[PDB]
Structure formats: structure tokens, C-alpha cells
Amino acid sequence: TYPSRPIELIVPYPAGGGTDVLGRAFALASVKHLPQNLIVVNKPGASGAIGWADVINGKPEGYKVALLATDLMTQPNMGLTKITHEDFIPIARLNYDPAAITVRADAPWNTVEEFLAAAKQGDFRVGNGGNGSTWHLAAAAVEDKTGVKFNHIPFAGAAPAALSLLGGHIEAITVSAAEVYAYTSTGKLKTLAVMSEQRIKGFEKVPTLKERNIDISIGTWRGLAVTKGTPPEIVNVLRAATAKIVTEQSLRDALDRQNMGYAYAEGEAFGAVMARDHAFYKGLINKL
Ligand SMILES: [Cl-]
Ligand SMILES: [Cl-]
Ligand SMILES: [Cl-]
């Protein structure tokens, strides 16, 4: 009966970081719900592709689980790997941290519509965490749907971009809502829209872009998958266990400590989101 020996959780991040913490918290929370241990392996490199290859090239027996992340959407579409979401069977999404449009609290704009009408008259500087990464692509996605043209300002990560905005050196940032909450909750920045499917915790008074008729959902995420070809009975054991594991308070606490949003999605739903996002990133990366 599956599982009959330990299961490796292949985490393509170094030990000690947020995703390692998430992976090990998931493993700890799995003790009541799987009769074999989940063992974390840290295999970073090539934006996840060394870890993906370990799972894909492994046997379809259920004893390797990939901790999938956003890079799976961008790397193949940048022509940097042949690996795609279709090499996997999804178990579940765990985490999603949507991008947001955030300005300084004293900005003249009080709605995303006012911000866009102003931006269309100029070359607003929009900070991100690096060229070609999620928050840059988030700003580019806004350009694509609204016709505005920004001056993209990459920094060495999201935190320096937020500090720049706080100092009045740029007009907006499109980094994660999670990264600006410390400032929006304390009146230093204000968020005009979240690029999510639904309103999120801590930002319940802020509209999504989608509800304002701007069709964009983008952000970083973490989920679980096994290699294509894994028997359905095995996939179902993992999906059923994961549905239990995500209700564990210890796992939710770990996500909170790492400032990572909880966003459980069932396997098939996670698969559908990845297919949609793959096509979205393909189109946007090609345009850029
Ligand atoms: Cl991380
Ligand atoms: Cl977020
Ligand atoms: Cl499921």
C-alpha cells in the first residue's frame, strides 16, 4: 500500500529560507496524515530545474514530490529549459502572494483608475525587484492591459523598491502585497489594487484588478506535484493527505511567520492555474 517507504520532498531552495521553512513545516504537519515520513531535500540551482529534473527523471512511484514555484512559468517561456508544468501532475497549491499597485500614502491618487489616468500622461517610475522577475512582469502586465507606459525601475529585490517609494524617489511599486503590508497597515504606503482572483487578508478594502475590469492575476506561489505518469491511486493518496495537512494550525503558523499567504488550491485547480499562467507568461515574455 502506498506509501510504504519515506517520501522525499524536493525543495529547490537552500536550507533556512522561507520555502525551506514551508517545506519542513508541511513535512511536520504530515505526520498524522501519512504513514511514512516526508523528508526534505534542498536542491536549488537553475531556478528550480535541477530539482525538477530529479523528480521528472525519478520513478513514477510517489516517493519524490516537487515543491513547485513560480519559476516553472517563466524559465521555459524564456527558452531556458524544456521542462514545463505538463511534466508534472499537481497535488495542490499551498501559497500565493499576489502583486499589487502601491503608492506613497500622500500620493494624489486615491483609486487605481485615478493612478492610471495620471500615468497615461507621463512616464511614471514603477519599482520592481529585478528585470524579468515577477514584479517587473506584473507592471508589464498592467501596461499590456491598460495601454499605459511605465519607466520600469529594477532594484536588488522588493525591499529596496519599497524603501525608494517611501522616500519619494519613484511613483509606484508592483511588488507583493505581502511586502508592503507593514507600510500600508501603518499609513506610510497605500495600495490601490491587488492582482489576485479575490480580495486578500489584510487588504479586504482594496479591489482586485479583475473586479475593476483589468484582467490580471500575478504573484509568486508554491505548490506540490509528482512526475507525469504517476498512478492515479498514488496521486489521490497525496491529494487526500494534503487536503488534511493544510488544515493543520502548525502549517498555517509557519506560513504566517514567513509572511507567505495561505492559498490552498486542489490539484486539478492548481493544474488549471498553471496552464493559464503558462500561456499568460508566454505572451507577455514574447511581447517584451
Ligand atoms: Cl523562498
Ligand atoms: Cl502578496
Ligand atoms: Cl485535490
Q: To which H or E segment does residue 242 belong?
A: helix 232-245
Domain coordinates of the chain in residue numbers? 1-97+219-288, 98-218
DSSP letter at 2? -
- Measured in Å, residue 204 CA sits from the centre of ligand 2 at 13
Residue type, 93: R
- Return the CATH architecture of domain 1-97+219-288: 3-Layer(aba) Sandwich (3.40)
Contacts of 79 (CB under 8 A, 6+ apart): none
- Measured in Å, residue 7 CA sits from the centre of ligand 2 at 30
Using DSSP, how many helices (H) and how many strands (E) does the chain show?
10, 11
Rounded Cα gap, residues 223 and 266, in angstroms: 10
User: Which residue in this structure is represented by grid cell 509606484?
Assistant: 172
What are the φ and ψ backbone dihedral angles of 189, each rounded to 5 degrees?
-125, 165
Tell me the residues surrounding ligand 3 (ion) with CB < 5 Å. Answer: 239, 266-267
Contacts of 147 (CB under 8 A, 6+ apart): 120
Q: Which ligand is nearest to the CA of 266?
A: 3
List, edge to edge, every strand of the sheet that includes 38-42: 38-42, 7-11, 64-69, 219-227, 88-98, 262-266
Strand partners, 10: 41, 66
Q: To which H or E segment does residue 225 belong?
A: strand 219-227
Rounded Cα gap, residues 12 and 51, in angstroms: 5
- Measured in Å, residue 268 CA sits from the centre of ligand 3 at 7
Q: Where are the alpha helices (DSSP H) in 83-201?
A: 112-119, 134-146, 158-166, 177-184
Q: Which ligand is nearest to the CA of 178?
A: 2
Q: Which ligand is nearest to the CA of 220?
A: 2
State the structure-solving technique.
X-ray
Superfamily of domain covering 98-218:
Periplasmic binding protein-like II (3.40.190.10)
Q: What is the CA radius of gyration of the chain?
A: 19
Residue type, 106: D
In SS3 terms, 245-288 reads as HCCCHHHHHHHHHCCCCEEEEEHHHHHHHHHHHHHHHHHHHHHC
Among residues 41, 34, 30, which one has the least CA distance to residue 8? Answer: 41
